[PDB]
Every structure is written in C-alpha cells, then in structure tokens.
C-alpha cells in the first residue's frame, strides 16, 4: 500500500536524522574558537572587462588561470584574456537565452546552454580559425542551469527537468541520467578528483552523486528555499550552498551534516553565486544586494566586501591558483578582484 | 610587442562587430507571450505572418520578435527574470472557457485559472514598468456560447444581460482590474478580429504607443 511504504519511508528519514545527531559531537564554531582571524580582506578591482551589451549570467575561469568565458542575453559568448583585458573570441549563439558556461580543462572546448534545452559545445582549436559548434546535446526537457566538463568527451549537465545527466560528446547521448531531485536543479559542482559531484535544486536539498554508478550517495537538507549555487571545498571533503534564505551553509560529505551557516541580519536578498579560496579559508558569495561578500569559512565572520556592481552579481569565480576573483553581474561588466 | 600589437587590433576588430550587432538588435522589437493551453496563442502566431520558440516578422518598416515560452513546463520563478525589459507582454485568454474546467483539477474553472496566471504576471516584481497587451480570443465562439448558457456559472455576480456586447465587456474589465500598477502600466485589450487580421496592427500601434508613451516617461515630459 501507499501508506505502508509512506509510514515506512518517514521512518527511514528518522534513522538518518537519529544517526546525524549522534555524530554531532561539537560545532565547528566551538572548534575554531581560538583560530586567529583572517583580518580585513581589502580586495580592489584590478581589471574591468567591457563588451557585453546585456546582463551576464555565467563565467568560468581557465585551468591556466588567465583566460575566461562569459555569456549574456545579447547572444554572445566571449573568451577574455584577463591579463590584457583584450577579447580572444566572440562566439555568436544560435539561442540568445544562455544561463551557463563551462571552459574545458584542456581549453580546447567551451560549452553553453539555457532555455533552448540544448548544451551547445564549441570547438576552439580549429584549423580554419573560427570557433565552430561541435555538438548539440539535446536530451533535456527543461532549461539547462549548469554544465561542467570532466574531459574533452564527458560533460555533466543539470537542467530544469529535475534531472542531471552525464553526456558523451562524440555520440551525443546521455551516458548516465541522475534522477531523484523533487525540484528544479540549479547548479552542480564537480569534485577535485572528478569522481563525484553535488547538485543543488529548487527543492531546498543538495544531493551527492556518483558519476560512474549514477546513484545518489547522500542528500543534505537544512536550507529553507531554492539552492542557487554550490561549490566543493578544495579537498573535496566539504561543499557550500547558496540559497534564497540569504544563508550559505558548509556541508560535510564524511560526517553527512551541516557545519556552518553564514547569515547576517543585514542581508535579506538571495545568494546567486558562491566560490571558495584556494586554501578554503575564504568563501566568496555573490548576493542580490548588488555587492559580493567574503566570508571567513572557519569563523563565519563577514570579513570583506566587494561592492563594485550596479546590478546583481550573477556569477563569481576564483582562479585555480587563487591569484584573482572575477565577478560578473547584470550591469554587463566583469571585474577582476585581487 | 609586434604580436601583442596585432592582438589589440583583434580586440578592436571584435569590438566593431559587437557594436554593429548591438545596434541592430536594438531596432528589433521584443514581445513575450504567455497563456493557457487552449488560449489561441497558436492562432495569434498564424495571424502574425521544443524550448523557447522564436518567430520573426516585419510590418510597416519595423521588425518584431515574438518569444512563445509557454513550452517551458518548469518553474517560472527561476527563469522569468530573463525576460525583464521586453517591450511588451502579449497575453492570450480564451473567452469560451467560462463554462469549462480543467480535467485534472476539481472545480477551478479554466477562466479562473487564466486569471491566476494574469494576476501573477501583471503584478510580477520583474515587470513593474512593462506594459501588457491582452488578447482575448475565441470571442466568436463566446458569442454563440453566451447565446445558450449564462455567464453567472463562473462569475457569481453579474449585473448584466446575456448579450455579447455586455457579456464580453464585463469580462474584459474584470481582467483589467487585476493590476495594482494602475499608474505605471497600460493594458491595451483587444478582441481577436478574424478577417481584418488587424491584431497585428493593434500590436504595432500598441508597441509604438508603448514606446512613445515610454519615451514620454523617462523624459519626464509626462
């Protein structure tokens, strides 16, 4: 019967919740009480990239920490050179409604997608020197919200159809499909080892997925509204979520609990992007307050603010070497903060 | 450097292309459409010449782009903000849905369901200044429908005769009262006209008015 399984199912949530309390020995805030603070983090706009004629939704750094990508509703995908602020490529999109970007780890490929329900992959290194579109991954039924390359052939995408998928670019078919989210999936983050990835959905939950098996290992709750951004800790043993509850939370994968909440009474708008520092000591979160805060990731003390944007800070990414932090916004400008 | 020097020539060649393209996109007109499944959005589109479908047409020396985004079937709370600043929001409701009901819900009339969508868009935090064009379709079938059935089925209150003239009028007005941004945005309601096809011309005029009136707004000459 439905009630047999339901009265059963609500019990299974109890042992999960019962065991999590038993493993809640002491709060990270108590353990990190005597750590010396990070001090005022004064970070200034070094470079400002101009050339977008609409609001920016997505940006992604390169693995060489110098090039980066950005997409906007103007239907242009631009590859920047952050050092010399000069445009390397300006890719016209078939669909002006783009909500995500990814720059391949090898830098041979770039991918974008949005309301057109397609993940388009553009080839950068092309004999005829004109970025050409390679493949169009059309297997989703809702807007694509995120996409992250594993290799030049594997890309994992999260969509508004409550499902994530792992693709094979050569064949253009979903190698694996991740199901179990009861709300629209907003963002995903890959583990450093590229064996696991966590996804945040509109159902106020984050799920840890396994890329090979295709089954969800753990599910984290605690937020009150949509989860809009997610990133792993550098060591791949923790991750942070940005929600519309104007709180960032640091979850652990081994302890399977929540550690911190980064909430401030002053802040009432929703978090749009989150990202870490190379050491994992700073958690940069791009709010709707038009500004971007920098949190002490082990003290939960707002040490630093990056207020330079007219409109909301849509995307926010840090370099692999951690020498810079770049924030996009709806004001059509990318700013490099160092 | 000799190489870096040619590099900044590329960034200037890129920027030229971006400008020419930016100013071409500006002259094109951006209309968002919404509506019920049986609204007649399909019928409106025919008159005008999966995913978000876009349609392009030119009329009286002006270019129009209609974004039928009704096929998204996801949560509108996350993706509607992308349309902030479209010229105008065409909206379609079928007048002949007053006596029906959705086969899935219990007793929420289709017409009451249409209002619910209209309420949430006309008062959406993202379209405060955006004007709304409201098309009311199936006016013909509504004439013949109202000649046999009463309107009291859907609206309990009706100080009015079962004549098309008055019957339609009450509904239109009933829709138009939904907006709390009375002193910001203009709802230009039109009844779908079969033969003249001037549904297109009404939009043309409604947009120029939205433009000319808007020009009046930012310029404070109003």
């Amino acid at each position: 019967e439905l009630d047999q399984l339901r009265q059963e199912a609500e019990q299974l949530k109890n042992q999960i919740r019962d065991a999590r309390k038993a493993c809640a020995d002491a709060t990270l805030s108590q353990i990190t009480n005597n750590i010396d603070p990070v001090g005022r983090i004064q970070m200034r706009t070094r470079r400002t990239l101009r050339g977008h004629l609409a609001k920016i939704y997505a940006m992604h750094w390169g693995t060489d920490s110098r090039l980066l990508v950005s997409a906007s509703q103007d239907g242009k995908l631009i590859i920047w050179d952050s050092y010399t602020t000069n445009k390397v490529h300006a890719i016209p999109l078939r669909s002006s409604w783009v909500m995500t970007c990814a720059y391949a780890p090898s830098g041979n490929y770039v991918a974008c997608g949005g309301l057109d329900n397609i993940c388009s992959i553009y080839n950068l290194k092309t004999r005829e020197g004109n970025v050409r579109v390679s493949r169009e991954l059309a297997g989703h039924t809702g807007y694509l919200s995120c996409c992250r390359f594993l290799d030049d052939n594997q890309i994992v995408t999260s969509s508004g159809d409550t499902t994530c998928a792992l693709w094979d670019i050569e064949t253009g078919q979903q190698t694996t499909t991740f199901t179990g989210h009861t709300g629209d999936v907003m963002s995903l983050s890959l583990a450093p080892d590229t064996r696991l990835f966590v996804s945040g959905a509109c159902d106020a939950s984050a799920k840890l997925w396994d890329v090979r098996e295709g089954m969800c290992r753990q599910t984290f709750t605690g937020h009150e509204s949509d989860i809009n951004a997610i990133c792993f800790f550098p060591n791949g043993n923790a991750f942070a979520t940005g929600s519309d509850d104007a709180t960032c939370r640091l979850f652990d994968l081994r302890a399977d609990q929540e550690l911190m909440t980064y909430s401030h009474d002053n802040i009432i708008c929703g978090i749009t992007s989150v990202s870490f520092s190379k050491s994992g000591r700073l958690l940069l979160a791009g709010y709707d307050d038009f500004n971007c805060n920098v949190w002490d990731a082990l003290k939960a003390d707002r040490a630093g603010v990056l207020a330079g944007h007219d409109n909301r800070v849509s995307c926010l990414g840090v370099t692999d070497d951690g020498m810079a932090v770049a924030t996009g916004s709806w004001d059509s400008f990318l700013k490099i903060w160092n | 450097s000799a190489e870096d020097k040619a590099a900044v020539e590329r960034s200037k060649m890129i920027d030229r292309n971006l400008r020419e393209d930016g100013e071409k996109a500006a002259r094109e007109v951006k209309l968002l459409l919404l509506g019920a499944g049986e609204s007649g959005k399909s019928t409106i589109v025919k008159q005008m010449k999966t995913g978000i479908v876009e349609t392009h047409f030119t009329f009286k020396d002006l270019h129009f782009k209609m974004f039928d985004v009704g096929g998204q079937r996801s949560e509108r709370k996350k993706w509607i903000h992308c349309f902030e600043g479209v010229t105008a929001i065409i909206f379609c409701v079928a007048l002949s849905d007053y006596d029906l009901v959705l086969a899935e819900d219990e007793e929420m009339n289709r017409m009451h369901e249409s209002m619910k969508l209209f309420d949430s868009i006309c008062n959406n935090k993202w379209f405060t200044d955006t004007s709304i064009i409201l098309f009311l379709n199936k006016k013909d079938l509504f004439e013949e429908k109202i000649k046999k059935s009463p309107l009291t089925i859907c609206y309990p209150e009706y100080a009015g005769s079962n004549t098309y003239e008055e019957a339609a009028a009450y509904i239109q007005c009933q829709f138009e009262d939904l907006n709390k941004r009375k002193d910001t945005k203009e709802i230009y309601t039109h009844f779908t006209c079969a033969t003249d096809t001037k549904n297109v011309q009404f939009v043309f005029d409604a947009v120029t008015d939205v433009i000319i009136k808007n020009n009046l707004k930012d310029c404070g000459l109003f």
Partner: single-chain antibody
Amino acid sequence: VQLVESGGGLVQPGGSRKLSCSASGFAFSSFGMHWVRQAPEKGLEWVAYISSGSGTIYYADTVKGRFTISRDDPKNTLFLQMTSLRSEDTAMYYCVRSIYYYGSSPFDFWGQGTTLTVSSSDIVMTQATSSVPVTPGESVSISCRSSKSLLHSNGNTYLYWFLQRPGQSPQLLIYRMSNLASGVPDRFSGSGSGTAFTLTISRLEAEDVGVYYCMQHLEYPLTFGAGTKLEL
C-alpha cells in the same frame, strides 16, 4: 585550407607586376597575412604584412615604398603590387597566414609560392651551421644565436622555427620556445633563453631531412636566419 598564389614568371627590370594569392578553405577575413620571399640560392626574407581588416600594413627596408599589399576579404584573395622591380628581387614569393591572439600559432600555414625571375636597429639572427651531416636514428641539435634579448617582459621569447623539406614550402615546427606546433611529431623540441637557442631532434627519418630556419617576432621587420641543412 590550401593557399595558392598567382603571377611571377619572367619580367624585364622596371616593370610592375601583381601577385594574387587566392585563399580557400579557412576564415581568410580574420587572418593577418604576410609575404616571405626566398632567393634561388639564399634563405628566407620577410617583405610585407597586413593585419586583420587591413588595419596595419608594414614593409621591409628593401621594399619600403616600392611594394603595395592589399587584401580582398569578400573574394578571399591577397594582392601584392610591385613597382619598378630590381635585379635583387628574384625570389620565390611564399604567402603566409598568421593569427595573433593569446596562445595562437602565427606563421602556421605557408602557401606554395610563385617563382619570379627579373631579367638582366634591426635584429640579426645568426646560425653558423650548414650542411651538417646526420644519420637516421641519432640525436641532432641545431643552435641559433640572436643579437638582442628576445625574452620580452611578459616572458615570451618570440623566436620561431621552420623546416623546409627539399622542394616543399616551409613548415612551422615551434611557434615560441618550449612550444610545439600542430601536426608535428613530439621528436622536435626547443629550449633556450635570451640570445641562445637550440632545436633538439631525438630521432629523425628521411621525411624530416632538409633546411631549417630561425625567425624572431619581437619586432618588425621579422629578420630571418641563414639556412641549416641536415645532410643525408
């Protein structure tokens, strides 16, 4: 992606002839083109250059004000207008394409060039090795010397390498020191700093025997070096 040029042949001195290079199979409108000439017995020598969209036109010392270079983007052609040819303009005129953006490979593709026989503050690159004997399966190193520190401030040593097999157009091997071109085996490698440069081949074959060239790109007019022919 082939490049072919038209013109050349036999011209009396003082005559004005035109060279047309019809690009085919690549985005010609976004490629900075060059011209490089090779004397019948001597090495390469840069002459001209046009940037993307005809924004920047440069020339060599021997052809300044004598040559006019133009491109026709819609027709995918490149033109060279030569005026009052001298006896010292007898050379094979290759056409080279190059694109400049972060991490690009300029001078990657070379035309077949045309034969032209007229009737009758500059960096100098020096390599004093010629007709060096070598056997297949051995390791050979080719050394180059500059008169100026090619290592720019940003750390880019704008030194290139080329390989011209007998009876073929020159082919890029190394577009900057410690970099490897596209479609060239891993055997070729180059390590150097400032004014000292080397090209190391681990194991060679009958296919890569020929003459090698060294070019700098720190500043115009892109002076080349003398040849370094591998003898086999």
